[PDB]
Design a protein around this ligand. Structure first.
Ligand SMILES: Cc1nn(-c2ccccc2)nc1C(N)=O
Lengths: 108, 108
């Protein structure tokens, strides 16, 4: 009602974010191969697989914890990448999608 | 050497407040104009409050400043529809903000 309604709603939102066509940069921990020096620059890495695990592990006891993890994915992307890069574009597209899903669910 | 941070922050904040897309963010959101804003947004922020905080010597680190200004954008994006003028302004100004922060070496 309180606790497991939240779990179901977050799982649904997170699964929908993950299936979106712009989610592909964010699906797994950034690979050093593909961004040597990423981990020198970004101090709190986050990605959607880590979020899936956190969710499964019952970490997301509130809306604000879930929002902070997902928002971190986007702020990492915008800190690391130039504004006209495909990655930055994907972040803003997926963020719009995310907020519509949050609103659609009445999450508060 | 001593007031270097203050000077950098003041310059960044001044440029952000002068930008043509800053107008939605210049002052606190009024309840009369935004139904249930303060039910949904728990950490309101605006650029007049940031100006005060800065004058008040609250911004003792780059991280405190970046968190406030990022909050201005994320509040807007959560609350408003994704094709609204406000949402468009927020992302424009957010791109501007990340470029100014990078330009000043305050991250990377
Ligand atoms: C809502 C909203 N309303 N306003 C607003 C700004 C200026 C004049 C009148 C209203 N800003 C926002 C915002 N930044 O979310």
């Amino acid at each position: 009602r309180d606790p497991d309604q939240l779990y179901s709603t977050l799982k649904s939102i997170l699964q929908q974010v993950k299936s979106h066509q712009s989610a592909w940069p964010f699906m797994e921990p950034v690979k050093r191969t593909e961004a040597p020096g990423y981990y020198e620059v970004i101090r709190f890495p986050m990605d959607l697989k880590t979020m899936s695990e956190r969710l499964k592990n019952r970490y997301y006891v509130s809306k604000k914890l879930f929002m902070a993890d997902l928002q971190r994915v986007f702020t990492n992307c915008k800190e690391y990448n130039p504004p006209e890069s495909e990655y930055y574009k994907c972040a803003n597209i997926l963020e719009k999608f995310f907020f519509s899903k949050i609103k659609e669910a009445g999450l508060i």
